[PDB]
Design an enzyme around this catalytic site. Structure first.
Site, PDB file in Angstrom:
ATOM      1  N   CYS A  34     -10.282  10.923 -26.297  1.00 17.09           N
ATOM      2  CA  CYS A  34     -10.368   9.490 -26.780  1.00 17.09           C
ATOM      3  C   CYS A  34     -10.021   8.581 -25.581  1.00 17.09           C
ATOM      4  O   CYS A  34      -9.104   8.346 -25.367  1.00 17.09           O
ATOM      5  CB  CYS A  34      -9.631   9.158 -27.983  1.00 17.09           C
ATOM      6  SG  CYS A  34     -10.084   7.593 -28.647  1.00 17.09           S
ATOM      7  N   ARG A  88      -7.876   4.927 -26.639  1.00 14.61           N
ATOM      8  CA  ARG A  88      -6.401   4.906 -27.087  1.00 14.61           C
ATOM      9  C   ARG A  88      -5.351   3.508 -26.880  1.00 14.61           C
ATOM     10  O   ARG A  88      -4.328   3.746 -27.448  1.00 14.61           O
ATOM     11  CB  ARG A  88      -5.529   5.929 -26.600  1.00 14.61           C
ATOM     12  CG  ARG A  88      -6.066   7.334 -27.174  1.00 14.61           C
ATOM     13  CD  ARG A  88      -5.618   8.498 -26.366  1.00 14.61           C
ATOM     14  NE  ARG A  88      -6.229   9.055 -25.285  1.00 14.61           N
ATOM     15  CZ  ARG A  88      -5.815   9.826 -24.537  1.00 14.61           C
ATOM     16  NH1 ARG A  88      -4.666  10.640 -24.705  1.00 14.61           N
ATOM     17  NH2 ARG A  88      -6.440  10.166 -23.437  1.00 14.61           N
ATOM     18  N   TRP A 100     -14.504   1.947 -33.376  1.00 15.07           N
ATOM     19  CA  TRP A 100     -15.704   1.276 -33.326  1.00 15.07           C
ATOM     20  C   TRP A 100     -16.488   1.915 -32.053  1.00 15.07           C
ATOM     21  O   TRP A 100     -15.731   2.772 -31.152  1.00 15.07           O
ATOM     22  CB  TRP A 100     -15.792  -0.111 -32.864  1.00 15.07           C
ATOM     23  CG  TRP A 100     -14.590  -0.711 -31.956  1.00 15.07           C
ATOM     24  CD1 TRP A 100     -14.625  -0.865 -30.829  1.00 15.07           C
ATOM     25  CD2 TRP A 100     -13.176  -0.985 -32.358  1.00 15.07           C
ATOM     26  NE1 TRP A 100     -13.549  -0.958 -30.081  1.00 15.07           N
ATOM     27  CE2 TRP A 100     -12.608  -1.464 -30.984  1.00 15.07           C
ATOM     28  CE3 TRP A 100     -12.563  -1.308 -33.561  1.00 15.07           C
ATOM     29  CZ2 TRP A 100     -11.129  -1.886 -30.862  1.00 15.07           C
ATOM     30  CZ3 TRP A 100     -11.178  -1.672 -33.331  1.00 15.07           C
ATOM     31  CH2 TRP A 100     -10.730  -2.031 -32.191  1.00 15.07           C
ATOM     32  N   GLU A 132     -22.324   6.019 -26.388  1.00 18.67           N
ATOM     33  CA  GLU A 132     -22.245   6.938 -27.581  1.00 18.67           C
ATOM     34  C   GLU A 132     -23.679   6.820 -28.356  1.00 18.67           C
ATOM     35  O   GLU A 132     -24.287   7.972 -28.381  1.00 18.67           O
ATOM     36  CB  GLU A 132     -21.351   6.810 -28.476  1.00 18.67           C
ATOM     37  CG  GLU A 132     -19.671   6.932 -27.919  1.00 18.67           C
ATOM     38  CD  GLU A 132     -18.812   6.833 -29.171  1.00 18.67           C
ATOM     39  OE1 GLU A 132     -18.718   7.773 -29.875  1.00 18.67           O
ATOM     40  OE2 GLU A 132     -18.066   5.866 -29.302  1.00 18.67           O
TER      41      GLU A 132
HETATM   42  C1  HEM Z   1     -10.955   2.263 -31.775  1.00 25.47           C
HETATM   43  C2  HEM Z   1     -11.765   2.276 -30.964  1.00 25.47           C
HETATM   44  C3  HEM Z   1     -12.282   3.509 -30.830  1.00 25.47           C
HETATM   45  C4  HEM Z   1     -13.146   3.838 -29.388  1.00 25.47           C
HETATM   46  C5  HEM Z   1     -13.629   2.891 -28.653  1.00 25.47           C
HETATM   47  C6  HEM Z   1     -12.999   5.321 -29.456  1.00 25.47           C
HETATM   48  C7  HEM Z   1     -13.808   5.846 -28.264  1.00 25.47           C
HETATM   49  C8  HEM Z   1     -13.904   7.253 -28.322  1.00 25.47           C
HETATM   50  C9  HEM Z   1     -15.078   7.922 -27.526  1.00 25.47           C
HETATM   51  C10 HEM Z   1     -16.369   7.277 -26.839  1.00 25.47           C
HETATM   52  C11 HEM Z   1     -15.105   9.346 -28.141  1.00 25.47           C
HETATM   53  C12 HEM Z   1     -16.102  10.323 -27.315  1.00 25.47           C
HETATM   54  C13 HEM Z   1     -16.834  10.558 -28.681  1.00 25.47           C
HETATM   55  C14 HEM Z   1     -18.119  11.414 -28.299  1.00 25.47           C
HETATM   56  O1  HEM Z   1     -18.199  11.912 -27.313  1.00 25.47           O
HETATM   57  O2  HEM Z   1     -18.551  11.933 -29.401  1.00 25.47           O
HETATM   58  C15 HEM Z   1     -13.961   9.300 -28.562  1.00 25.47           C
HETATM   59  C16 HEM Z   1     -13.390  10.616 -28.935  1.00 25.47           C
HETATM   60  C17 HEM Z   1     -12.294  11.020 -29.805  1.00 25.47           C
HETATM   61  N1  HEM Z   1     -11.594  10.034 -30.464  1.00 25.47           N
HETATM   62 FE1  HEM Z   1     -11.664   7.998 -30.288  1.00 25.47          FE
HETATM   63  N2  HEM Z   1     -12.182   5.994 -30.073  1.00 25.47           N
HETATM   64  C18 HEM Z   1     -11.629   4.831 -31.027  1.00 25.47           C
HETATM   65  C19 HEM Z   1     -10.939   5.157 -32.102  1.00 25.47           C
HETATM   66  C20 HEM Z   1     -10.389   6.378 -32.479  1.00 25.47           C
HETATM   67  C21 HEM Z   1      -9.326   6.754 -33.322  1.00 25.47           C
HETATM   68  C22 HEM Z   1      -9.036   5.628 -34.503  1.00 25.47           C
HETATM   69  C23 HEM Z   1      -9.053   7.855 -33.352  1.00 25.47           C
HETATM   70  C24 HEM Z   1      -8.155   8.555 -34.407  1.00 25.47           C
HETATM   71  C25 HEM Z   1      -7.275   7.938 -35.152  1.00 25.47           C
HETATM   72  C26 HEM Z   1      -9.512   8.497 -32.197  1.00 25.47           C
HETATM   73  C27 HEM Z   1      -9.632   9.783 -31.845  1.00 25.47           C
HETATM   74  C28 HEM Z   1     -10.420  10.635 -31.130  1.00 25.47           C
HETATM   75  C29 HEM Z   1     -10.562  11.977 -31.076  1.00 25.47           C
HETATM   76  C30 HEM Z   1      -9.706  12.981 -31.900  1.00 25.47           C
HETATM   77  C31 HEM Z   1     -11.875  12.191 -30.290  1.00 25.47           C
HETATM   78  C32 HEM Z   1     -12.143  13.611 -29.753  1.00 25.47           C
HETATM   79  C33 HEM Z   1     -13.499  13.691 -30.832  1.00 25.47           C
HETATM   80  C34 HEM Z   1     -14.176  15.079 -30.738  1.00 25.47           C
HETATM   81  O3  HEM Z   1     -13.306  16.015 -30.099  1.00 25.47           O
HETATM   82  O4  HEM Z   1     -15.238  15.402 -31.012  1.00 25.47           O
HETATM   83  N3  HEM Z   1     -10.404   7.530 -31.752  1.00 25.47           N
HETATM   84  N4  HEM Z   1     -13.168   8.091 -28.826  1.00 25.47           N
HETATM   85  N1  LIG Z   2     -15.908   5.617 -31.163  1.00 26.02           N
HETATM   86  C1  LIG Z   2     -15.868   6.446 -31.997  1.00 26.02           C
HETATM   87  N2  LIG Z   2     -14.917   6.424 -32.929  1.00 26.02           N
HETATM   88  O1  LIG Z   2     -14.016   5.224 -33.336  1.00 26.02           O
HETATM   89  N3  LIG Z   2     -16.434   7.325 -32.094  1.00 26.02           N
HETATM   90  C2  LIG Z   2     -16.591   8.603 -32.826  1.00 26.02           C
HETATM   91  C3  LIG Z   2     -17.732   9.917 -32.409  1.00 26.02           C
HETATM   92  C4  LIG Z   2     -18.988   9.208 -32.712  1.00 26.02           C
HETATM   93  C5  LIG Z   2     -20.145   9.865 -31.975  1.00 26.02           C
HETATM   94  N4  LIG Z   2     -20.154  10.149 -30.583  1.00 26.02           N
HETATM   95  C6  LIG Z   2     -21.618   9.110 -32.237  1.00 26.02           C
HETATM   96  O2  LIG Z   2     -22.187   8.576 -31.159  1.00 26.02           O
HETATM   97  O3  LIG Z   2     -21.983   8.866 -33.653  1.00 26.02           O
END
Ligand code: HEM
Ligand SMILES: N=C(NO)NCCC[C@H](N)C(=O)O
Ligand code: HEM
Ligand SMILES: C[C@H](O)[C@H](O)[C@H]1CNc2nc(N)[nH]c(=O)c2N1
Ligand SMILES: C[C@H](O)[C@H](O)[C@H]1CNc2nc(N)[nH]c(=O)c2N1
Ligand SMILES: N=C(NO)NCCC[C@H](N)C(=O)O
Ligand SMILES: [Zn+2]
Lengths: 412, 413
Positions: free
Chosen positions: B110, B113, B282, B287
């Site tokens: 992520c 963070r 968000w 993405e």
């Molecule tokens: C708040 C704004 C946030 C942004 C901009 C963000 C951004 C991202 C992005 C771009 C990814 C890659 C997603 C993909 O390639 O499908 C990601 C993955 C991930 N995020 Fe975030 N995220 C946010 C919030 C959160 C929150 C609230 C959580 C958990 C409480 C979180 C936990 C994770 C986890 C566990 C992954 C890996 C998902 C997977 O393995 O498929 N993120 N995040």
């Molecule tokens: N930024 C976040 N979560 O807050 N992404 C969650 C995974 C979304 C997924 N990559 C999509 O394009 O639908």
């Protein structure tokens, strides 16, 4: 212990068995992945024979004479030779096979579909730095080939006692100089500032321009290195223009046609070849994305963006990204128009995927470093982004080595 | 290796990682193989649970500066007795909040963070039925959407007990578009969701069969067969996609939803397993604009966009694909910003993450990160993350993958 790799666009799965023949460590442990670390960290008689044997076994297996009298004779011969002379000498055939396979095994190289067509120049009879200069000019001319580039490696004598190393001090045969300025800024290529200081220190009369082809600084037989200037007529350069923006030519950009990594160490059958410069041809992103746009390289994005008149007050206009694409259209178009071999990242990555499949089929795998193989622009619109890869070390191999100015003992 | 250096190759900043020493499970890597780019690599008994509980409560009590206090020791004793006696234990509200925030803090894939400490935690552990889940999930969606001014949130349903009473959201995200495989072998809508769309249809969903149909929720409570619910349309914020310069762009018919809400991961805290724990932040623009729109195995719009741009599509070396990719991403960011839906571009996101990461080294001794995932899928080396060495390792609390429940579920009938 038999590992699967999946492509997530094609759902194709390949099975890797080749990784069990993997020798040295990766950097990573059970509790920690070091996949994105760029650098993660002479042989005794007993160290050398198992290495020699490992290599000879694969050689004879490749020519379908494994376990033959020819094979057993050679092993004994080499064994006798290490016992008596503490090292050994490769036959020409073994040298050629080893160098091709070093490339075949190079997990960071996207260009490996071509691995078996390498031209190998045996420079093991070389004794002096002038000899080295002549060998390199011949390499540069053979490989450039008027713009129709051909892969080649030139192999100088193997390390012996570690005090008679051959080295090319340059990181590539052809690179531009870097000059730190009184106004704190940098002229030319910031990657090369230090090596340029070493040249000047040693005698080079620097022109002090932006695109000064560096001189060769060549060390033979453990001696102190000497300077030589590549015949300008041998250094093909390409002036950078854009098919649509007439103003691009006024940025005053050029690049050289021949990429020739010259600072690596080639390991074959335990033997160490410290001077082994090799060359292929460029993938466009190498120049357009990295050499031109890295903040620590020629760093031209702002300049180009300004001339395109993009909205630069906010990152979310993606002006950086728009400029990047145009810079890269220009590089490719400029090389193509001058008839200098260049490959775009789409074509390059599709070939590597075909090569991976060939390799999985015929060899049981293909070591590959995803971090290096995926281009620095448009990652996910290339097929390699979607492809799982296993990075492991096979021998023969190309290895990094300390820059020699950190190690050399100046006789004077 | 009590000390591990990582270098940034742009700035020469070297940071020293000690945090990896607290690393719990493993990576799929051995000493002779790096599986850095593998997507999914390789109930608890009392034995196994008390150390996991202890480890976590030591972390919790240490974070609130009460390590070794009577309260700390009483809580250890109370949990220990609870496990011995009931086989599981219950987290206090404060501990569940701390745990949820820390799973985010620890999520190595992520890039978002920097925000980890601002998560809104919704405690849904009193939920017993699927209609109950639907209500909680609706409340999460409205809170998080906030009329376009998005707020991070997580809703946490009861933990696993015997593995036969699991809560699961069968949706992979709370809001996603249906995909429909046609007889001629083409796909209408999102090909990523074809299998789940088919499951929904089987369970009784009446599919509108368009290109952008919001899927119904399929919710399993207490190990029971899952049930279907339509999210109220008024709660689903969407954004029609247009371009600031190309007026023909809107006629592509593109839109996307504003709330990305991953609903299929498992939250591990103190050895406990929360199998339904949807969370939402968000979007980062790539993405939608790189992956969702331009992956060949997704909406795959690159050609149609390039045709309408009249790029030279005869030769890949025109870089027509790259040119189209950029304009599509401009359009996503433009459209969200114009409608006032939170969205972040990959330059801002990655710059913020590097700041977050440096701050975590200094204050935490580390920041686990997966470079393969953190670096964006376009313009990689012009973002600072590309140039940054990263160490990937697993800390708990964490979010984990779990198999799709249609593959494991025991149907009651
Ligand atoms: C708040 C704004 C946030 C942004 C901009 C963000 C951004 C991202 C992005 C771009 C990814 C890659 C997603 C993909 O390639 O499908 C990601 C993955 C991930 N995020 Fe975030 N995220 C946010 C919030 C959160 C929150 C609230 C959580 C958990 C409480 C979180 C936990 C994770 C986890 C566990 C992954 C890996 C998902 C997977 O393995 O498929 N993120 N995040
Ligand atoms: N930024 C976040 N979560 O807050 N992404 C969650 C995974 C979304 C997924 N990559 C999509 O394009 O639908
Ligand atoms: C023939 C066309 C070739 C193409 C298109 C090609 C492409 C590439 C590219 C793009 C890289 C990454 C370079 C970087 O990011 O700096 C690379 C790295 C590498 N290549 Fe090639 N290459 C070719 C020829 C060769 C040859 C002839 C050899 C050896 C005989 C070779 C061995 C290697 C090695 C060892 C690396 C890692 C370099 C490093 O770590 O700095 N390649 N190649
Ligand atoms: C095989 C490779 O791991 C795969 O395509 C990865 C690459 N990096 C990723 N990065 C992000 N953010 N999301 C992904 O889905 C991917 N997928
Ligand atoms: C930190 C990271 O390893 C570094 O910036 C890498 C990324 N991938 C690379 N890929 C290639 N082909 N060449 C490089 O120099 C880099 N550098
Ligand atoms: N294609 C090759 N070799 O054949 N590249 C070698 C490294 C060149 C270096 N990346 C540069 O941009 O100058
Ligand atoms: Zn690894």
């Amino acid at each position: 212990r038999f590992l699967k790799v999946k492509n997530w666009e094609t759902d194709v799965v390949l099975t890797d068995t080749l990784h069990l023949k993997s020798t040295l460590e990766t950097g990573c442990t059970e509790h920690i992945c070091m996949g994105s670390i760029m650098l993660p960290s002479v042989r005794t008689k007993d160290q050398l024979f198992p290495l020699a044997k490992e290599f000879l076994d694969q050689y004879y297996s490749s020519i379908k004479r494994f376990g033959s009298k020819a094979h057993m004779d050679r092993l004994e011969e080499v064994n006798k030779e290490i016992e008596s002379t503490s090292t050994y000498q490769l036959k020409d055939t073994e040298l050629i096979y080893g160098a091709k396979h070093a490339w075949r095994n190079a997990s960071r190289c996207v260009g490996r579909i071509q691995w078996s067509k390498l031209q190998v120049f045996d420079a093991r009879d070389c004794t002096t730095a002038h000899g080295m200069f002549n060998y390199i000019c011949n390499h540069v001319k053979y490989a450039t080939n008027k713009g129709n580039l051909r892969s080649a490696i030139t192999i100088f004598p193997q390390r012996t006692d570690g005090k008679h190393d051959f080295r090319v001090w340059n990181s590539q045969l052809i690179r531009y100089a870097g000059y730190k300025q009184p106004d704190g800024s940098t002229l030319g290529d910031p990657a090369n500032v230090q090596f340029t200081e070493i040249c000047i220190q040693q005698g080079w009369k620097a022109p002090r321009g932006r695109f000064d082809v560096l001189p060769l600084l060549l060390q033979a037989n453990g001696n102190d290195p000497e300077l030589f200037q590549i015949p300008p007529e041998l250094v093909l350069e390409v002036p950078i223009r854009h098919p649509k923006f007439d103003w691009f030519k006024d940025l005053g950009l050029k690049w050289y046609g021949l990429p020739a990594v010259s600072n690596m160490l080639l390991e074959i059958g335990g033997l160490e070849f410290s001077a082994c410069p090799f060359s292929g041809w460029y993938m466009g992103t190498e120049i357009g994305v990295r050499d031109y746009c890295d903040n620590s390289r020629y760093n031209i994005l702002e300049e180009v963006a300004k001339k395109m008149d993009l909205d630069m007050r906010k990152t979310s206009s993606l002006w950086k990204d728009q400029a990047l694409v145009e810079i890269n259209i220009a590089v490719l178009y400029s090389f193509q128009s001058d008839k200098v071999t260049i490959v775009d990242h789409h074509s390059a990555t599709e070939s590597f995927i075909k090569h991976m499949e060939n390799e999985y089929r015929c060899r049981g795998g293909c070591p590959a470093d995803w971090v290096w193989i995926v281009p620095p622009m448009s990652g996910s619109i290339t097929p390699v982004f979607h492809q799982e890869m296993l990075n492991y070390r096979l021998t023969p191999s190309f290895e990094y080595q300390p820059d020699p100015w950190n190690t050399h003992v100046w006789k004077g």
